[PDB]
Amino acid sequence: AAKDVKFGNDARVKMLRGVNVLADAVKVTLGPKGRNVVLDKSFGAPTITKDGVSVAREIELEDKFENMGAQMVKEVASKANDAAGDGTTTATVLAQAIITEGLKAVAAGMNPMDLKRGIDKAVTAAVEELKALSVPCSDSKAIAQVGTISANSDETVGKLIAEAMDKVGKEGVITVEDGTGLQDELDVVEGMQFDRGYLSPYFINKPETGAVELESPFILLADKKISNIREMLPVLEAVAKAGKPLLIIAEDVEGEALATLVVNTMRGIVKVAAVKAPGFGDRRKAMLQDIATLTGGTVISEEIGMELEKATLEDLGQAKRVVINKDTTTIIDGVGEEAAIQGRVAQIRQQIEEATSDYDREKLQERVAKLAGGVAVIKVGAATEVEMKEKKARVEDALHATRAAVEEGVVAGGGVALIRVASKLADLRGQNEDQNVGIKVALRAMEAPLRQIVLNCGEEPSVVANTVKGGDGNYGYNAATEEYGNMIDMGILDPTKVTRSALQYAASVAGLMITTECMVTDLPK
């Protein structure tokens, strides 16, 4: 259709207004003292929340161009979220600060590319600096502490997460489920995990979860593109008569077969979840054989000769519970016999022994690791279902934070790491004047997080920011108690990885955002 186009400073100010609207919408909820925000519901009561992610997913603007700026900040915030799992408000605030300053500089007539280059230099310097300032979290006690603070200061959740972390090692797989008894339970059962996502979002049985949980499902293994709907018809009849959930792992799924499965899920007669084949080529087939071993299933490939039509209920594997996340998938207690799994472990281990390629050897090593380590299973213990699910969600976010911190590290919360980095790197210069201006933009930009936190606390942001700048080390201003002190001593912490990713994504989005001219759109009808 006829598409409008505007470019130059006018488009820049429009997109600036849009991102400003979104930033004002989301920044309020930052911090403990982040104020409540009320969001719509087409029926019934409006919802009340302090979670910025809901605000981001629910916000869009009537004006096209402002809406598009809002979408830029929204998608980069979501990228940060899926990268780490928290701190989305922090990333959005950083983005607003950097982008507002960059636009006002561009209004001053500076060269945009020089500003972008200076920003890139400043942000990479900050990344390496905070990497230096990172503190390892390998010790169990700090893991318990971070899990505690993430779960609204619940020490039991931290203890359980730490124990599970011990059980399955540093890079194990942990899943949480509902426990019947009032006491928490923990058990290591061999399972599987791999990074693949659902074919369509429509498979999500619990939209709030964002994932598909299936109990006692039947798993289909395939190394072929599922061109036609006639291929899986016997399997569909089989799972219809079985009356149980169905999981599919295929090299590819076409739009038509997926759409038919979507129609089937809306029919509710059969609930089908489909995922892509992990790995590539030979390695893909090798872990497909691993899955067949784990579930007692059979691998169906075009090259060997068998097809999906020649599929029986026996041919498919099985397991006790599978979860299909946004881009991950895990399986728990595959029916496949442990002895066959051990034989496969030995085969892959001797393959490692004869391995000469480094990357293939690493693939085999991680394959045996995921195959032998298994999966830890938490079972939430409480009285009523409401607190069952509350504890479940708290455990989920806590373990996400814990694995994030374990992966990279941890620093003092309150954004104090950012301002400390700013004080350290204030002297960093650029090749030319405009690059230096962008450097200064970045250096004064990451004061915004604690500033907005203080604003949500009601105190004057500038005074507290100056006070923190005066202090050194891990000294800052507890928002909850509204008093100064060392965050580490009082348990306030934040993973290094989440802050690093947030800053990187904010810098990247701002760099591409400032350098845009032609904000095209469709005719407003």
Residues 379-408 that bind a second copy (CB under 8 A): 383-385, 388
46 binds, among ligand ADP, a second copy, none (CB under 5 to 8 A by kind): a second copy
Sign of the alpha-carbon torsion through 276, 280, 285, 290: negative
Identity of the residue numbered 239: V
List the x/- string, 30-69, binding to ligand ADP by CB under 6 A: xxx------------------xx-----------------
Determine if residue 478 is labeled as part of a ligand binding site: yes
Residue 496 binding ligand ADP, by CB under 6 A: no
Determine if residue 30 is labeled as part of a ligand binding site: yes
Determine if residue 1 is labeled as part of a ligand binding site: no
Closest CB to ligand ADP among residues 113, 345: 113
Q: How far is the CB of 402 from a second copy (least distance, A)?
A: 27
Give the separation between CA 258 and CA 274, rounded to whole angstroms.
8
Which residues 219-238 are close enough to bind a second copy by CB under 8 A?
Answer: 227-228, 230-231
Give the residue ranges of DSSP H helices in 355-447.
358-373, 385-407, 416-425, 433-445
Strands 246-250 and 218-222, bridge-based pairing: parallel
Residue 9 binding a second copy, by CB under 8 A: no
Residue 325 binding ligand ADP, by CB under 6 A: no
Which residues 113-172 are close enough to bind a second copy by CB under 8 A?
Answer: 113-114
Determine if residue 521 is labeled as part of a ligand binding site: no
- The interface region with ligand ADP, picked from 98-106, 116-124, 125-133, 413-421 by CB under 6 A, is 413-421
Closest CA to 101 of 122, 78, 74, 127: 122
Give the separation between CA 310 and CA 307, rounded to whole angstroms.
6
Give the separation between CA 60 and CA 76, rounded to whole angstroms.
15
413 binds, among ligand ADP, a second copy, none (CB under 5 to 8 A by kind): ligand ADP
Read off the tokens for 76.
């980069």
Give the separation between CA 116 and CA 138, rounded to whole angstroms.
37
Residue in the structure block whose two tokens are 């054989």 = 289
Determine if residue 86 is labeled as part of a ligand binding site: yes
Residues in a beta bridge with 38? 48
- The interface region with ligand ADP, picked from 2-10, 86-94, 282-290, 427-435 by CB under 6 A, is 86-94
Task: Work out the angle between the directed axes of helices 448-457 and 416-425 (0-180°, nearest 10).
Answer: 140
Residue 181 binding a second copy, by CB under 8 A: yes
86 binds, among a second copy, ligand ADP, none (CB under 5 to 8 A by kind): ligand ADP
501, 72 in Cβ contact below 8 A?
A: no
148, 491 in Cβ contact below 8 A?
A: yes
List the x/- string, 454-473, binding to a second copy by CB under 8 A: ---xx-x-xx--x-------
Residues constituting the chain: 525
Identity of the residue numbered 287: M
Residue 197 binding ligand ADP, by CB under 6 A: no
Residue 201 binding a second copy, by CB under 8 A: no
- What does residue 395 show for φ and ψ, rounded to 5 degrees? -65, -40
Residue 520 binding a second copy, by CB under 8 A: yes
Q: What is the DSSP string of 44-92?
A: SSPEEE--HHHHHHH---SSHHHHHHHHHHHHHHHHHHHHTSS-HHHHH
Q: Please compute Rg for the chain using Cα positions.
A: 26
522, 64 in Cβ contact below 8 A?
A: yes
280 binds, among ligand ADP, a second copy, none (CB under 5 to 8 A by kind): a second copy
Closest CA to 52 of 86, 84, 16, 82: 86
Give the separation between CA 75 and CA 513, rounded to whole angstroms.
13
Q: How far is the CB of 379 from ligand ADP (least distance, A)?
A: 26
Closest CB to ligand ADP among residues 225, 400: 400
354, 114 in Cβ contact below 8 A?
A: no
Give the separation between CA 160 and CA 516, rounded to whole angstroms.
48
Residue 356 binding a second copy, by CB under 8 A: no
Q: Give the single-character DSSP code of 264.
A: H
Closest CB to ligand ADP among residues 143, 492: 492
Residue 40, C-beta contacts closer than 8 angstroms, at least 6 positions apart: 46, 47, 58
- The interface region with ligand ADP, picked from 80-88, 204-212, 253-261, 350-358 by CB under 6 A, is 80-88
- The interface region with a second copy, picked from 156-164, 286-294, 352-360, 402-410 by CB under 8 A, is 352-360
Q: How far is the CB of 54 from a second copy (least distance, A)?
A: 10
Q: How far is the CB of 515 from a second copy (least distance, A)?
A: 5
- The interface region with ligand ADP, picked from 243-251, 309-317, 407-415, 466-474 by CB under 6 A, is 407-415
Read off the tokens for 317.
């594997």
Determine if residue 90 is labeled as part of a ligand binding site: yes
414 binds, among ligand ADP, a second copy, none (CB under 5 to 8 A by kind): ligand ADP
Q: How far is the CB of 412 from ligand ADP (least distance, A)?
A: 8
Closest CA to 23 of 103, 95, 75: 95
Give the separation between CA 217 and CA 82, rounded to whole angstroms.
27
Which residues 424-483 are close enough to bind ligand ADP by CB under 6 A?
Answer: 453, 478-480
Q: How far is the CB of 415 from ligand ADP (least distance, A)?
A: 5
Find the binder of ligand ADP among 179, 415, 430, 438 (CB under 6 A): 415
Annotated binding-site ranges for ATP:
29-32, 50, 86-90, 414, 478-480, 494
Residues at the interface with ligand ADP (CB under 6 A): 30-32, 51-52, 86-90, 413-415, 453, 478-480, 492, 494
